[PDB]
């Protein structure tokens, strides 16, 4: 009874910009010795499910990780469809189930603020950029950093999980370390958020300079 299962929603970027949303069913804490788990999908409407890709990864910690990514319809998801993931295990008699749906509640456009840290002694060839995105709901949001109209890898920046505000809205922080070589090429960096409540195009962004 140590096994864990997670179902993620489509990232807002995949939903509106790429327009190829996907949901992922993540399984953890499975022993390598245990036989492979059967993983299947189901829709609340009874309409069929698309082919899903299955990936299995060994980890430093000895626990097997299994994920299944399922492409979903853009209009299907927005309309309120319920998708469901089922994990079947030989060692487990009962099955685990996880369900996902478009989150319901009020909508608020995200406020975006971008800042640059002043230079610090011994970090002169370094600069750090910050972005605060807040008072948006629901919590589903994506953050991207673009330098010179070309978006920067997701591995360059670290963004926190959405946390509640003292009001009703959520907020996140994004942090990016930029080199002297980058800001001398062009000293403009864009913090872009993708959120369904943003109007129009589900995009709000702010520019910042070193």
């Amino acid at each position, epitope marked *: 009874r140590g096994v864990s299962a997670y179902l993620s929603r489509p990232s807002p970027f995949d939903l509106f910009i790429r327009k190829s949303p996907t949901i992922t069913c993540l399984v953890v804490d499975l022993a390598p010795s245990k036989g492979t788990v059967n993983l*299947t999908w*189901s*829709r*609340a*409407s*009874g*309409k069929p499910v698309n082919h899903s890709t299955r990936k299995e990864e060994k980890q430093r910690n000895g626990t097997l990780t299994v994920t299944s990514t399922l492409p979903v319809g853009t209009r299907d998801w927005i*309309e*309120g469809e*319920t998708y*469901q993931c*089922r994990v*079947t*295990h030989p060692h*487990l*008699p*009962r*099955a685990l*189930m996880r369900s996902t749906t478009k989150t319901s509640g009020p909508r608020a456009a995200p406020e975006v603020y971008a800042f640059a840290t002043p230079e610090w002694p011994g970090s002169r060839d370094k600069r750090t950029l910050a972005c605060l995105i807040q008072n948006f709901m629901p919590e589903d949001i994506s953050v991207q950093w673009l330098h010179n109209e070309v978006q920067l890898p997701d591995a360059r920046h670290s963004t926190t999980q959405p946390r509640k505000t003292k009001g009703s809205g959520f907020f996140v922080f994004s942090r990016l370390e930029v080199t002297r070589a980058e800001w001398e090429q062009k000293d403009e960096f864009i913090c872009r958020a993708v959120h369904e409540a943003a109007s129009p195009s589900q995009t709000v962004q702010r520019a910042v300079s070193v």
Partner: antibody
């Protein structure tokens, strides 16, 4: 998207007569998904599942009433119907229409109607 | 004879607010498949239409108070109301959707004494 189902066509019925019940669906299109069912409750008895028509057009009937019952839909009116013949005293019941949601090959009745009363008197 | 018969007990019970209520559903044939049980629980107040409480044995339907919980496997299933409330005066039915035709139990009337 909230879904509402309204039955109509109930009333007093003579034994051996025929019955047409219609369920008017609003807020969702019966061709877009889910299974649509008719379920009846006889006075002082358990619920009985009568008939179902899948969104794609498949129909299933309960052996207990099969042969004298037909379930149909009218896409233009977003309505489905129940037609029963050779009515009996056992047919006296409240007829509910329900929308069954789908789970891994099996269906459960998540949305129900208000129900309509059918009375048969000899 | 081929239809899966569902028997509930008790047929009727009277309890007070705060009590733990326990309702049993026995099936003539097992309703298990693929690591799940396709037994659902409905709540029906008198003369009104039913409401779905639990589907697939143990999965709570959205918006149903957390005080309702279902359990069991094979041919033996149990609905549990952990802390009965005044609005829980209703008849409760189990229904199997594993095999055609779908059948319900006879009903369990829960009277608040």
């Amino acid at each position: 998207s909230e879904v509402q189902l309204v039955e109509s066509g109930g009333g007093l019925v003579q034994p051996g007569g025929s019955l047409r019940l219609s369920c008017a669906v609003s807020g969702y299109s019966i061709t877009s998904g889910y299974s649509w069912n008719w379920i009846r409750q006889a006075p002082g008895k358990g619920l009985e599942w009568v008939a179902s028509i899948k969104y794609s057009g498949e129909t299933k009937y309960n052996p207990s009433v099969k042969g004298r019952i037909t379930i149909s839909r009218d896409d233009s009116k977003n309505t489905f119907y129940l037609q029963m013949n050779s009515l009996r005293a056992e047919d006296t019941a409240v007829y509910y229409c329900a929308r069954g949601s789908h789970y891994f090959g099996h269906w459960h009745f998540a949305v129900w109607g208000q129900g309509t009363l059918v009375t048969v008197s000899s | 004879g081929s239809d899966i018969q569902l028997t509930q007990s008790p047929s009727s019970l009277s309890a007070s607010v705060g009590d733990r209520v326990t309702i049993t559903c026995r099936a003539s044939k097992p309703v298990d498949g693929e690591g799940d049980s396709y037994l659902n629980w409905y709540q029906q107040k008198p003369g009104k239409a039913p409401k779905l409480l639990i589907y697939a044995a143990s999965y709570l339907e959205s918006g149903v108070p957390s005080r309702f919980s279902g359990s069991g496997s094979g041919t033996d299933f149990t609905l549990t109301i952990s802390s009965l409330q005044p609005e829980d005066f209703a008849t409760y039915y189990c229904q199997q959707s594993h095999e055609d035709p779908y059948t319900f139990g006879q009903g369990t009337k829960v009277e608040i004494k």
